[model samples]
Target: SRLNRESVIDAALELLNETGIDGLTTRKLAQKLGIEQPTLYWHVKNKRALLDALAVEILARHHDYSLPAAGESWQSFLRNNAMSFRRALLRYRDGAKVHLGTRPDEKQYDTVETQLRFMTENGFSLRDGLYAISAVSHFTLGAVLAQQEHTAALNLPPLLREALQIMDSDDGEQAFLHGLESLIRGFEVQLTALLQIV
Candidate 1:
């Protein structure tokens, strides 16, 4: 019988949730699957390959690559996409950690392509499109990573309330989302102005 790819990946993800990135290994995955280490290797070439597959699987679940309607504003599309990606990364335990180091594979390329196209159509030059995509990506990744680190500390309502009071801020969630929006707005404004003059 052929090995179940989904089962193997599911087992791997389960182990990931329990042990995090450092503790995951082929041997451990094999143990969880109740199979020989070699059997696991047959499905995933190596740890790196396994990590890559994990990232693909994670992103695939999170993103729907269907391009937005032709008339939709690029900024709106990108913001929604980024937020969706961030939420997907947060779904699994240690998901952000699993996704951070793995280079973008085909699955990720689809999302990147969509973002780049959006930028170009919005009057950003190729260089600016690339920069805008990179900036938003880095900012979102950093925000998610920071959120992950503070997850435990952020659970207490009193602490959150106190923090909000100290900062004198309203809607922490909106504030965080707006921070990204503001960054994108700045780029959009500058790009629009530049293209108009050119």
Candidate 2:
């Protein structure tokens, strides 16, 4: 029988979602696949590689992770990036934490290239475009990490923190949107000036 890398990765994700990133282990993944632990090595070398595969799996859910669609407005491109990324991160338990914990092979997730291409293709200089993209990525990832961890990651007193709901999902979403839009608008200030020359 042929060993399927897809099946191996699939079971790994199931393990991750079920017990989260911490509890995912090669022994367990092997058991889930009904394969010996060494057999798992054919697909991944270690927990880090396994997580890299999983991160790639999550980002592969969105085309934006590879490239922006041709002919999209720069603003639309940023919005699309944020929404798709946030959607991807929310799909699993502690997904944001998993992403933060592992650095996926950049080639597999060419998000940086896509952002720079979209910005320069529109009106930004490459350097500023890099900075702009970095800023947006930081904002989006940070906000998502904070909100994503709210319910699952903490035990705060109800009055000051949360003995109840983690944090409001709507509040998280609205906060992201509010911040995202503002930065995009502010970037437009530079975009406008840069557009005049380009």
Candidate 3:
């Protein structure tokens, strides 16, 4: 295939941009690179593995990240980290889906560990930190998805329209931050109350 992993993924990423995630297939990617489908498999193994690698690379593309400093408040640290995650996934088309369930690659594992440790140091128990991280993750992925290409909310029932303050979300940004803030405060309260009870 004469193509290395980096070149293959770079091509795949280009394909991802040219055609959304749904359009990315091994055969198509191979065709784009003038290689056979089997040749592509040698590097990524399968479509799932390819997407997983892309997910990690999408995050790694963000080079401006910084760890939370000592004495930083939990809400501030998590909110900043969460926003950073959002920006990373938002960089590419269909990036949210790529990042939705995938864990970091080995190269990015320590970055994940650092964020986890930061959470633990800031009064989040291991379990709480996991939930907190997932909360941020889900929030970013869902919001980004909705923001980029939203249409599902159009079918909203009368019961949900006004009562949920659903939609406008001002293209999802205003609504995302509003919901994110609420989730953080609510989670903070839950963690504290449950900690005392435990």
Candidate 4:
């Protein structure tokens, strides 16, 4: 009998939701799959490899808005992509943590190539385009990390408590929205200045 790679990843993802990243060990995964560790090892060598695969799988399965629609502006694409990415990371327990430090999947090359091309076609230099893309990615990841932490603050000073309340309410969605808008607007300023210099 042969074991499928996708089947392994599917089981690992299920275990991730049940136990989260900290508790998702190879031993537990093998138990869930009804296989011994050695057989599971053939497909995924270690917990790191399984986690990396899961990170890629999560994006492939849930992060659908990565590419811009025809004639869509770069700003719109960035906004929609960020929102979609945030949703995907929030879908699983500790998903952002799982994505942290994982290598990029080779399958994303074509999509990313199209994204860079879209920016160049719209007047962004390649470097600036990459910068904009990276900025959005970092911001979105950081936002999700904070949201998922579910930090319970002890009795704080007046202003701190007020702010924490806002962040806790709606799961910090309002703050994320405002921050995203500000980031995009800042990029527009940068783009305009670049045009002026040209």
Candidate 5:
């Protein structure tokens, strides 16, 4: 009997949850599925293909997140979407790591288009919208990547706390998120000026 494609993807996702991106492999997947490695190859061509598909699958799950229907400004929409994307990246054991390397497949492209459309409709020119989206995307990716790395670091608490104490911040988490939000605020200012001329 042939194994189902969804079954293979399910198994892959399960392995990702337990073992993370680096730990997932064809041999291990085959072992978990009680099939030969060759049989696993029939579903996904190789590890890269599996990883790519996994990225696509993850985006498909959360890509339809709706923006605020009313009273949502462009800045608010961008911030909300960026935060949502970050949350989704933190879902799997190395979700961001997998997604960072894979190209944006159809699902990702759709999400990006929607975001760009939101900006353009709100008064940004096409170029301004593209620049704003790219900048915010890069900033979010960098922030999440740094967060993931620091979380995995053994000295994260003491190191971060020492830095926070130096800064005299009572609430480090709030400060960090606020700093990120500030980037969007800056972008919004520049975007507004650009749109005014358009």
Candidate 6:
């Protein structure tokens, strides 16, 4: 079969599991695909572009909860979407690292547009709605970044030791969930306050 964009992206994701973001190189990817660097470049122009594509593919493949369900509340959609985003980031080795600092691709425009429109329909101005979406995304990204970093700490104060133990347990999912809830609730509070003003 001839090389194609999807096939290239597929190989790149597989390579990501083995080499991670820093070790991932166009030469290495070309070697893995049995293609020359120029050929690979035809599909993805450079390392930055490749990373951006990979980040988008990760969500496209794993994030099933991107869109709101029928009659789903804005708050519920944000919560669910945040959880889904977290799962997608945690799927591969250095997955979260791969996602950080990458811009959303053209593939996501429709879904993002719908999400923004959904929030606006639910009583948010467009700018505020975009902020709400960005907040959920930023919060989820931070949680994943911390969890994926796998920090090691010892011999701290009593309170620090106790908190570290909790962080070590359950792989940080519970804490992430709690924080996600708090963030969504905070958005809810803001939305309510805005409604009260008008």
Ranking of models by lDDT: 4, 6, 3, 2, 1, 5
Give one clash count per candidate, in the order shown: 0, 0, 0, 0, 0, 0
Best by TM-score: 4
Q: Per-residue CA lDDT of candidate 3, range 1-198, in tens?
A: 458877887888989887788888888888988987777777768889899989877777773454776778878877887778778877777888777777667897787799888888877789889898888878778889876655323487887887456565355667778888998998888878864863
Model 3: residues >4 Å from true position, as ranges? 149-169, 191-198
RMSD of each: 4.4, 4.3, 3.5, 2.3, 4.1, 2.5
For model 4, how many clashes?
A: 0
Candidate 1, 64-133: lDDT as tens digits: 5336656877777768767877787777766777788777786567756776777787787889888877
Which of candidates 4 and 6 is the stronger one according to lDDT?
4
Question: Which 10-residue span in candidate 1 carries the lowest summed lDDT?
Answer: 166-175
Clashing pairs in 5: none
Which sections of candidate 6 miss by over 4 Å? 151-154, 195-198
C-alpha TM-scores of all predictions: 0.80, 0.80, 0.81, 0.92, 0.80, 0.90
lDDT of 4 at 123: 86
Candidate 6 clash pair list = none
lDDT of 5 by residue, 1-198 (tens): 346877787788889888777778989988888999788777778889888888778767764453544768887777776777777776776777878867667746765677677878888888978887777667766766666655555246898889867555442335446866887787777766753753
**CA shift of 149, model 6, Å:** 2.4
Q: Candidate 2, residues 13-59: lDDT per residue as tens digits? A: 88888887778888888887888978878777899887777777878
Weakest 10 consecutive residues of candidate 4 by summed lDDT: 146-155
| Comparing 5 and 6 on TM-score, the stronger one | 6
lDDT of 6 by residue, 47-124 (tens): 888888888989999999999999999989998999899999999767888888887678899998899899999999
| Tens digit per residue, CA lDDT, model 4, 126-190 | 99998998899899899988877664122699999998777657886788989999999999999
Question: How far in Å is the alpha carbon of 170 misplaced in model 3?
Answer: 3.5
Best by lDDT: 4
* TM-score, cand. 4: 0.92
**Model 6 alpha-carbon miss at residue 64, Å:** 0.6
Cα displacement (Å) at residue 31, model 2:
1.8
